[PDB]
């Protein structure tokens, strides 16, 4: 495989027609010092195409979706130049012909202030399994700097999520600890302490969420049960506005800890029961807003609600659930297509679950008028990929981000509230 150097590869950044890809894990690629380089993240404008991805089937289509064709230079580099070897060797195999192997990126390119890099501002909410097991090892780990954790498995009503396989010492919790089904919104703030109290969580303590996904369908009497990935952030959403000031998500669930070849646990790990949650419930409503305020910002040029729904759901064919009667949409949200139902995310997942590339997420945002610029309230039914979508956006470091927590459900639950219909 040929070779680039540093000085080419720095009087090429900025060009559109060298496409530089990085092949090291999407944690590597968001920010994590992995190998404790001085400074982590990616090479400026470089796109995320993991190592990992090569075993998966889906490979050859994710390099053409990410509009990446046998026409273009393409530089690829990882922690090493041998890591890049089977992936120049795929690329070339598909009829990819100009593939070049930049060989110093680590510790050349990292460890030098003036070659640029950028980074998920807020990464390190957003671990990687290695993190996860350092973290339950008591190893030392990078970005963590508490004496108290616990690892938590989300899921809806489905505990044999848990008892299926976990990761080892983690408990779990029911998505109906922190969230109402009959408001479908977070709980109160007295319900929120006891639960979180009964969960063994603090504000103090750092909480990593989990969840499993298992092929949410629509047949089923509850499709939620199996996403339980989704869940997860929908529970850290409700533990930050809560209070629980160290909050991660493990990126992409359960399935990046099997395939990271950690231990499995069946265990029905026993709760903790700690006496004070320590800090006043909400301690930050601002990532909160209900359907008053919702409305205000749907009049304002300085906010916008964001539909982060189905299309059938958009266009009023279906509800979306089985427990949600009315179809159609609250008029003048912007419109942040989920994936294909009211459980999936593909549109803002890697085929792993993984968060997609933040910069197509961001792109993609940025076509609809959904920028940083505005206070942007992520919505859906009822808060699920709601709360997925603002993290992705809190992630980015947006400063005005919430989850309208009300959403559809809310909204049509009044028969007084507008609504629409039909293609727009
Ligand atoms: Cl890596
Ligand atoms: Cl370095
Ligand atoms: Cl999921
Ligand atoms: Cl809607
Ligand atoms: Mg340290
Ligand atoms: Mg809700
Ligand atoms: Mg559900
Ligand atoms: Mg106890």
């Known amino acids: 495989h040929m070779e680039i150097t540093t000085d080419s590869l720095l009087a090429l950044l900025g060009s559109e027609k060298v496409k530089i890809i990085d092949v090291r894990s999407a944690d590597a ?15 400026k404008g470089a796109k995320s195409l993991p190592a990992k991805w090569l075993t998966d089937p889906e490979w050859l289509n994710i390099v053409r979706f990410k509009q990446i064709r046998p026409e273009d230079a393409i ?39 003036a070659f640029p890099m950028d980074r998920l501002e807020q990464y390190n909410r957003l671990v990687p399994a290695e993190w996860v097991n350092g973290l339950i090892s008591g190893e030392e ?54 639960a979180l109290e009964e969960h063994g969580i603090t ?67 026993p709760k903790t029961t700690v006496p004070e949650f320590g800090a006043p419930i909400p301690s930050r409503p601002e990532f909160a807003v209900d359907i008053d305020e919702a409305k205000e910002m749907l009049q304002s040029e300085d906010s916008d609600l964001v539909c982060v729904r189905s299309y059938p759901e958009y266009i009023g064919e279906v509800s979306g659930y089985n427990y949600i009667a009315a179809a159609g949409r609250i008029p003048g949200a912007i419109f942040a297509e989920c994936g294909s139902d009211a459980y999936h995310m593909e549109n803002y997942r890697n085929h792993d679950h993984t968060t997609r590339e933040y910069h197509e997420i961001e792109d993609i945002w940025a076509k609809s008028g959904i920028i940083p610029k505005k206070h942007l309230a992520f ?10 979508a603002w993290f992705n956006a809190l992630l980015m470091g947006w400063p005005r981000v919430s989850v309208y927590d009300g959403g559809w459900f809310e909204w049509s639950n009044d028969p007084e509230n507008p609504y629409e219909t039909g293609v727009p």
């Open 379 to 388: 919505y859906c039914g009822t808060g699920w990929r709601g709360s997925e």
């Open 75 to 113: 530089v690829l580099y990882g922690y090493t130049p041998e890591e890049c070897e089977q992936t120049a060797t795929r690329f070339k195999e598909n009829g990819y012909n100009n593939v070049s192997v930049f060989h110093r990126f680590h510790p050349d390119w990292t460890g030098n202030d």
């Open 203 to 269: 504000a103090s303590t750092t909480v990593v969420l989990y969840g499993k996904f298992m092929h949410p369908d629509n047949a089923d009497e509850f499709p939620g049960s199996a996403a339980g990935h989704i869940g997860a952030i929908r529970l850290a959403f409700i533990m930050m506005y809560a209070g629980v000031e160290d909050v991660r998500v493990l990126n992409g669930g359960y399935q990046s800890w099997t395939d990271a070849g950690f231990a499995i646990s069946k265990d029905d790990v």
């Open 29 to 43: 690629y968001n920010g994590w010092r992995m190998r404790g380089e001085v400074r982590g993240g990616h090479i």
């Open 141 to 194: 780990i990078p970005e963590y700097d508490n004496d108290t954790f616990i690892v938590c498995h989300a899921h809806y009503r489905n505990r044999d999520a848990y008892l299926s396989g976990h990761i080892p010492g983690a408990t779990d919790m029911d998505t109906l600890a922190l969230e109402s089904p009959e408001t479908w919104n977070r709980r109160t703030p007295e319900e929120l302490k006891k």
